mmCIF file of all heavy atoms in Angstrom:
data_model
loop_
_atom_site.group_PDB
_atom_site.id
_atom_site.type_symbol
_atom_site.label_atom_id
_atom_site.label_comp_id
_atom_site.label_asym_id
_atom_site.label_seq_id
_atom_site.Cartn_x
_atom_site.Cartn_y
_atom_site.Cartn_z
ATOM 1 N N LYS A 7 -28.005 80.994 41.411
ATOM 2 C CA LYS A 7 -26.527 81.174 41.475
ATOM 3 C C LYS A 7 -25.815 79.875 41.085
ATOM 4 O O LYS A 7 -25.671 78.974 41.885
ATOM 5 C CB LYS A 7 -26.238 81.527 42.935
ATOM 6 C CG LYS A 7 -25.867 83.006 43.041
ATOM 7 C CD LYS A 7 -25.930 83.444 44.506
ATOM 8 C CE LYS A 7 -26.689 84.770 44.611
ATOM 9 N NZ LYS A 7 -28.130 84.392 44.578
ATOM 10 N N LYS A 8 -25.362 79.777 39.864
ATOM 11 C CA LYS A 8 -24.655 78.544 39.429
ATOM 12 C C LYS A 8 -24.192 78.677 37.976
ATOM 13 O O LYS A 8 -24.961 78.516 37.050
ATOM 14 C CB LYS A 8 -25.684 77.420 39.565
ATOM 15 C CG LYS A 8 -24.961 76.077 39.681
ATOM 16 C CD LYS A 8 -25.119 75.529 41.101
ATOM 17 C CE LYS A 8 -24.547 74.111 41.170
ATOM 18 N NZ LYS A 8 -23.113 74.296 41.526
ATOM 19 N N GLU A 9 -22.934 78.963 37.772
ATOM 20 C CA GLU A 9 -22.408 79.102 36.382
ATOM 21 C C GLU A 9 -23.398 79.873 35.504
ATOM 22 O O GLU A 9 -24.234 79.293 34.840
ATOM 23 C CB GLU A 9 -22.249 77.668 35.876
ATOM 24 C CG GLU A 9 -21.894 77.686 34.388
ATOM 25 C CD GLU A 9 -22.870 76.791 33.620
ATOM 26 O OE1 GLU A 9 -24.033 77.148 33.541
ATOM 27 O OE2 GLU A 9 -22.437 75.764 33.124
ATOM 28 N N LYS A 10 -23.307 81.175 35.494
ATOM 29 C CA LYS A 10 -24.238 81.980 34.659
ATOM 30 C C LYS A 10 -24.174 81.517 33.199
ATOM 31 O O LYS A 10 -23.671 80.453 32.898
ATOM 32 C CB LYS A 10 -23.740 83.421 34.786
ATOM 33 C CG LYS A 10 -24.842 84.292 35.397
ATOM 34 C CD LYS A 10 -24.666 85.739 34.932
ATOM 35 C CE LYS A 10 -25.777 86.606 35.528
ATOM 36 N NZ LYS A 10 -26.061 87.634 34.488
ATOM 37 N N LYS A 11 -24.679 82.307 32.291
ATOM 38 C CA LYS A 11 -24.649 81.917 30.860
ATOM 39 C C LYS A 11 -23.263 81.381 30.480
ATOM 40 O O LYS A 11 -22.258 81.791 31.026
ATOM 41 C CB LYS A 11 -24.958 83.207 30.102
ATOM 42 C CG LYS A 11 -26.469 83.326 29.885
ATOM 43 C CD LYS A 11 -27.173 83.437 31.238
ATOM 44 C CE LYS A 11 -28.577 84.014 31.040
ATOM 45 N NZ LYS A 11 -29.213 83.142 30.015
ATOM 46 N N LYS A 12 -23.204 80.463 29.553
ATOM 47 C CA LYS A 12 -21.890 79.894 29.140
ATOM 48 C C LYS A 12 -20.879 81.013 28.860
ATOM 49 O O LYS A 12 -21.192 82.002 28.230
ATOM 50 C CB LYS A 12 -22.186 79.109 27.863
ATOM 51 C CG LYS A 12 -22.429 77.638 28.209
ATOM 52 C CD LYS A 12 -21.090 76.941 28.457
ATOM 53 C CE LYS A 12 -21.316 75.695 29.316
ATOM 54 N NZ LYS A 12 -20.451 75.890 30.513
ATOM 55 N N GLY A 13 -19.664 80.849 29.312
ATOM 56 C CA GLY A 13 -18.622 81.885 29.069
ATOM 57 C C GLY A 13 -19.212 83.285 29.251
ATOM 58 O O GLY A 13 -20.281 83.447 29.804
ATOM 59 N N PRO A 14 -18.477 84.253 28.775
ATOM 60 C CA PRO A 14 -18.901 85.672 28.872
ATOM 61 C C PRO A 14 -20.131 85.943 27.999
ATOM 62 O O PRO A 14 -20.439 85.192 27.094
ATOM 63 C CB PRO A 14 -17.695 86.446 28.376
ATOM 64 C CG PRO A 14 -16.972 85.486 27.515
ATOM 65 C CD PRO A 14 -17.188 84.122 28.104
ATOM 66 N N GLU A 15 -20.844 87.003 28.273
ATOM 67 C CA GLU A 15 -22.050 87.325 27.483
ATOM 68 C C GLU A 15 -21.746 88.427 26.488
ATOM 69 O O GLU A 15 -22.610 89.046 25.900
ATOM 70 C CB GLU A 15 -23.033 87.742 28.567
ATOM 71 C CG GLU A 15 -23.585 89.154 28.338
ATOM 72 C CD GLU A 15 -24.738 89.103 27.334
ATOM 73 O OE1 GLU A 15 -24.831 88.120 26.617
ATOM 74 O OE2 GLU A 15 -25.509 90.048 27.297
ATOM 75 N N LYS A 16 -20.508 88.641 26.318
ATOM 76 C CA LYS A 16 -20.008 89.667 25.389
ATOM 77 C C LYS A 16 -20.554 89.429 23.977
ATOM 78 O O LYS A 16 -20.981 88.339 23.650
ATOM 79 C CB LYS A 16 -18.516 89.434 25.443
ATOM 80 C CG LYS A 16 -17.824 90.664 26.012
ATOM 81 C CD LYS A 16 -17.946 91.836 25.037
ATOM 82 C CE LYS A 16 -18.605 93.022 25.746
ATOM 83 N NZ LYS A 16 -18.758 94.067 24.694
ATOM 84 N N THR A 17 -20.549 90.431 23.135
ATOM 85 C CA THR A 17 -21.073 90.225 21.757
ATOM 86 C C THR A 17 -20.647 91.330 20.777
ATOM 87 O O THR A 17 -20.678 91.134 19.580
ATOM 88 C CB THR A 17 -22.584 90.221 21.901
ATOM 89 O OG1 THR A 17 -22.951 89.761 23.193
ATOM 90 C CG2 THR A 17 -23.197 89.314 20.835
ATOM 91 N N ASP A 18 -20.248 92.475 21.246
ATOM 92 C CA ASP A 18 -19.823 93.552 20.297
ATOM 93 C C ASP A 18 -18.310 93.648 20.264
ATOM 94 O O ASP A 18 -17.667 93.267 19.307
ATOM 95 C CB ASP A 18 -20.445 94.841 20.842
ATOM 96 C CG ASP A 18 -20.897 95.725 19.676
ATOM 97 O OD1 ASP A 18 -20.280 95.649 18.628
ATOM 98 O OD2 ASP A 18 -21.851 96.464 19.855
ATOM 99 N N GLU A 19 -17.742 94.120 21.314
ATOM 100 C CA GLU A 19 -16.267 94.212 21.376
ATOM 101 C C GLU A 19 -15.694 92.798 21.373
ATOM 102 O O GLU A 19 -14.516 92.578 21.171
ATOM 103 C CB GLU A 19 -15.959 94.924 22.690
ATOM 104 C CG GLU A 19 -15.850 96.430 22.436
ATOM 105 C CD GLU A 19 -14.630 96.989 23.171
ATOM 106 O OE1 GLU A 19 -14.435 96.625 24.318
ATOM 107 O OE2 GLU A 19 -13.911 97.774 22.572
ATOM 108 N N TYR A 20 -16.546 91.840 21.600
ATOM 109 C CA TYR A 20 -16.118 90.424 21.622
ATOM 110 C C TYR A 20 -15.937 89.903 20.193
ATOM 111 O O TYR A 20 -15.248 88.928 19.962
ATOM 112 C CB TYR A 20 -17.240 89.719 22.401
ATOM 113 C CG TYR A 20 -18.117 88.893 21.497
ATOM 114 C CD1 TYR A 20 -18.348 87.555 21.807
ATOM 115 C CD2 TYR A 20 -18.691 89.460 20.359
ATOM 116 C CE1 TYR A 20 -19.157 86.774 20.979
ATOM 117 C CE2 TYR A 20 -19.500 88.681 19.524
ATOM 118 C CZ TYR A 20 -19.732 87.335 19.833
ATOM 119 O OH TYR A 20 -20.531 86.566 19.011
ATOM 120 N N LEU A 21 -16.531 90.554 19.231
ATOM 121 C CA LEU A 21 -16.370 90.108 17.830
ATOM 122 C C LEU A 21 -14.898 89.812 17.576
ATOM 123 O O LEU A 21 -14.523 88.728 17.174
ATOM 124 C CB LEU A 21 -16.820 91.293 16.985
ATOM 125 C CG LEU A 21 -18.193 91.012 16.379
ATOM 126 C CD1 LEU A 21 -18.244 89.593 15.812
ATOM 127 C CD2 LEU A 21 -19.260 91.172 17.462
ATOM 128 N N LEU A 22 -14.060 90.778 17.822
ATOM 129 C CA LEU A 22 -12.610 90.580 17.615
ATOM 130 C C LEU A 22 -12.127 89.420 18.480
ATOM 131 O O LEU A 22 -11.162 88.752 18.169
ATOM 132 C CB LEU A 22 -11.989 91.902 18.036
ATOM 133 C CG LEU A 22 -12.104 92.895 16.876
ATOM 134 C CD1 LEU A 22 -11.050 92.559 15.821
ATOM 135 C CD2 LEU A 22 -13.498 92.807 16.237
ATOM 136 N N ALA A 23 -12.811 89.165 19.553
ATOM 137 C CA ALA A 23 -12.425 88.040 20.425
ATOM 138 C C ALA A 23 -12.564 86.737 19.633
ATOM 139 O O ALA A 23 -11.662 85.926 19.577
ATOM 140 C CB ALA A 23 -13.416 88.080 21.589
ATOM 141 N N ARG A 24 -13.699 86.544 19.015
ATOM 142 C CA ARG A 24 -13.932 85.324 18.219
ATOM 143 C C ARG A 24 -13.426 85.514 16.790
ATOM 144 O O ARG A 24 -13.280 84.571 16.037
ATOM 145 C CB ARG A 24 -15.445 85.143 18.220
ATOM 146 C CG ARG A 24 -15.855 84.225 19.371
ATOM 147 C CD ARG A 24 -16.588 83.003 18.814
ATOM 148 N NE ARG A 24 -17.752 82.808 19.724
ATOM 149 C CZ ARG A 24 -18.715 81.996 19.386
ATOM 150 N NH1 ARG A 24 -18.455 80.942 18.663
ATOM 151 N NH2 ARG A 24 -19.940 82.238 19.769
ATOM 152 N N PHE A 25 -13.166 86.733 16.417
ATOM 153 C CA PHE A 25 -12.673 87.018 15.045
ATOM 154 C C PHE A 25 -11.661 85.955 14.614
ATOM 155 O O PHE A 25 -11.662 85.500 13.487
ATOM 156 C CB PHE A 25 -11.996 88.379 15.174
ATOM 157 C CG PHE A 25 -12.859 89.455 14.560
ATOM 158 C CD1 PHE A 25 -14.252 89.327 14.565
ATOM 159 C CD2 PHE A 25 -12.262 90.592 14.000
ATOM 160 C CE1 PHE A 25 -15.049 90.335 14.008
ATOM 161 C CE2 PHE A 25 -13.058 91.599 13.443
ATOM 162 C CZ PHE A 25 -14.451 91.470 13.447
ATOM 163 N N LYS A 26 -10.778 85.575 15.499
ATOM 164 C CA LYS A 26 -9.750 84.574 15.162
ATOM 165 C C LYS A 26 -10.303 83.153 15.113
ATOM 166 O O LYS A 26 -9.565 82.186 15.102
ATOM 167 C CB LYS A 26 -8.714 84.721 16.258
ATOM 168 C CG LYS A 26 -7.851 85.928 15.933
ATOM 169 C CD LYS A 26 -8.720 87.181 15.862
ATOM 170 C CE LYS A 26 -7.830 88.422 15.948
ATOM 171 N NZ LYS A 26 -7.972 89.085 14.622
ATOM 172 N N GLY A 27 -11.584 83.018 15.093
ATOM 173 C CA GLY A 27 -12.192 81.663 15.054
ATOM 174 C C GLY A 27 -13.259 81.598 13.967
ATOM 175 O O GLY A 27 -12.967 81.516 12.791
ATOM 176 N N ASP A 28 -14.497 81.613 14.363
ATOM 177 C CA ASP A 28 -15.602 81.530 13.380
ATOM 178 C C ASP A 28 -16.047 82.923 12.939
ATOM 179 O O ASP A 28 -17.205 83.143 12.656
ATOM 180 C CB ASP A 28 -16.736 80.850 14.138
ATOM 181 C CG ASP A 28 -16.188 79.681 14.963
ATOM 182 O OD1 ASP A 28 -15.674 79.933 16.038
ATOM 183 O OD2 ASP A 28 -16.298 78.556 14.504
ATOM 184 N N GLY A 29 -15.150 83.862 12.872
ATOM 185 C CA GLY A 29 -15.549 85.230 12.443
ATOM 186 C C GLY A 29 -15.546 85.276 10.928
ATOM 187 O O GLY A 29 -16.473 85.725 10.284
ATOM 188 N N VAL A 30 -14.487 84.800 10.383
ATOM 189 C CA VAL A 30 -14.307 84.760 8.920
ATOM 190 C C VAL A 30 -15.434 83.968 8.248
ATOM 191 O O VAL A 30 -15.987 84.382 7.248
ATOM 192 C CB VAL A 30 -12.938 84.063 8.730
ATOM 193 C CG1 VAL A 30 -12.663 83.055 9.834
ATOM 194 C CG2 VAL A 30 -12.924 83.279 7.452
ATOM 195 N N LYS A 31 -15.752 82.818 8.765
ATOM 196 C CA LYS A 31 -16.806 81.987 8.134
ATOM 197 C C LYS A 31 -18.013 82.828 7.707
ATOM 198 O O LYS A 31 -18.362 82.862 6.544
ATOM 199 C CB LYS A 31 -17.183 80.968 9.202
ATOM 200 C CG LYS A 31 -17.289 81.634 10.576
ATOM 201 C CD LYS A 31 -18.677 81.372 11.158
ATOM 202 C CE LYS A 31 -18.925 79.862 11.226
ATOM 203 N NZ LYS A 31 -20.286 79.721 11.814
ATOM 204 N N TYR A 32 -18.659 83.505 8.613
ATOM 205 C CA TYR A 32 -19.817 84.318 8.219
ATOM 206 C C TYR A 32 -19.369 85.707 7.763
ATOM 207 O O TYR A 32 -20.003 86.334 6.943
ATOM 208 C CB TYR A 32 -20.667 84.372 9.473
ATOM 209 C CG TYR A 32 -19.940 85.085 10.578
ATOM 210 C CD1 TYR A 32 -19.678 86.453 10.478
ATOM 211 C CD2 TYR A 32 -19.549 84.377 11.714
ATOM 212 C CE1 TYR A 32 -19.016 87.115 11.519
ATOM 213 C CE2 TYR A 32 -18.893 85.035 12.759
ATOM 214 C CZ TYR A 32 -18.625 86.406 12.662
ATOM 215 O OH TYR A 32 -17.979 87.057 13.693
ATOM 216 N N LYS A 33 -18.270 86.194 8.266
ATOM 217 C CA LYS A 33 -17.801 87.530 7.831
ATOM 218 C C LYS A 33 -17.825 87.593 6.314
ATOM 219 O O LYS A 33 -18.430 88.457 5.709
ATOM 220 C CB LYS A 33 -16.380 87.632 8.371
ATOM 221 C CG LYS A 33 -16.408 88.315 9.739
ATOM 222 C CD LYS A 33 -15.883 89.744 9.610
ATOM 223 C CE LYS A 33 -14.372 89.759 9.861
ATOM 224 N NZ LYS A 33 -13.844 90.828 8.970
ATOM 225 N N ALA A 34 -17.178 86.660 5.712
ATOM 226 C CA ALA A 34 -17.136 86.591 4.230
ATOM 227 C C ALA A 34 -18.544 86.610 3.656
ATOM 228 O O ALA A 34 -18.885 87.391 2.793
ATOM 229 C CB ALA A 34 -16.476 85.250 3.929
ATOM 230 N N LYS A 35 -19.340 85.719 4.125
ATOM 231 C CA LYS A 35 -20.734 85.598 3.643
ATOM 232 C C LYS A 35 -21.583 86.812 4.044
ATOM 233 O O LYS A 35 -22.215 87.430 3.212
ATOM 234 C CB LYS A 35 -21.243 84.330 4.318
ATOM 235 C CG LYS A 35 -20.645 83.106 3.622
ATOM 236 C CD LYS A 35 -21.678 81.981 3.584
ATOM 237 C CE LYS A 35 -21.830 81.381 4.984
ATOM 238 N NZ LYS A 35 -23.075 80.567 4.922
ATOM 239 N N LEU A 36 -21.616 87.157 5.304
ATOM 240 C CA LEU A 36 -22.427 88.309 5.730
ATOM 241 C C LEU A 36 -22.114 89.529 4.885
ATOM 242 O O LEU A 36 -22.895 90.454 4.776
ATOM 243 C CB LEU A 36 -22.011 88.494 7.155
ATOM 244 C CG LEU A 36 -22.518 87.280 7.905
ATOM 245 C CD1 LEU A 36 -22.312 87.503 9.385
ATOM 246 C CD2 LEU A 36 -24.004 87.068 7.587
ATOM 247 N N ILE A 37 -20.970 89.525 4.283
ATOM 248 C CA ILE A 37 -20.545 90.620 3.441
ATOM 249 C C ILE A 37 -21.287 90.561 2.100
ATOM 250 O O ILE A 37 -21.970 91.487 1.711
ATOM 251 C CB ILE A 37 -19.067 90.297 3.323
ATOM 252 C CG1 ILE A 37 -18.250 91.173 4.261
ATOM 253 C CG2 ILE A 37 -18.614 90.445 1.910
ATOM 254 C CD1 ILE A 37 -19.052 91.497 5.523
ATOM 255 N N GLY A 38 -21.156 89.470 1.400
ATOM 256 C CA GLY A 38 -21.844 89.338 0.103
ATOM 257 C C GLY A 38 -20.892 88.790 -0.950
ATOM 258 O O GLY A 38 -20.751 89.332 -2.030
ATOM 259 N N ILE A 39 -20.247 87.722 -0.638
ATOM 260 C CA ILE A 39 -19.317 87.102 -1.555
ATOM 261 C C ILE A 39 -20.069 86.312 -2.603
ATOM 262 O O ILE A 39 -20.897 86.816 -3.335
ATOM 263 C CB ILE A 39 -18.485 86.233 -0.622
ATOM 264 C CG1 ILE A 39 -19.386 85.260 0.153
ATOM 265 C CG2 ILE A 39 -17.788 87.160 0.354
ATOM 266 C CD1 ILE A 39 -18.643 83.940 0.374
#
Side-chain angles (χ1 to χ4, degrees):
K7 252 166 227 81
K8 202 110 173 89
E9 172 233 68
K10 241 207 179 214
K11 269 63 161 53
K12 265 282 158 237
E15 123 82 341
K16 243 292 124 184
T17 332
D18 217 330
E19 268 225 316
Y20 107 127
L21 254 315
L22 278 283
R24 267 239 223 168
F25 255 31
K26 281 60 163 114
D28 317 81
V30 31
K31 43 124 57 179
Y32 64 68
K33 267 254 269 146
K35 285 216 287 166
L36 293 188
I37 259 32
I39 57 146

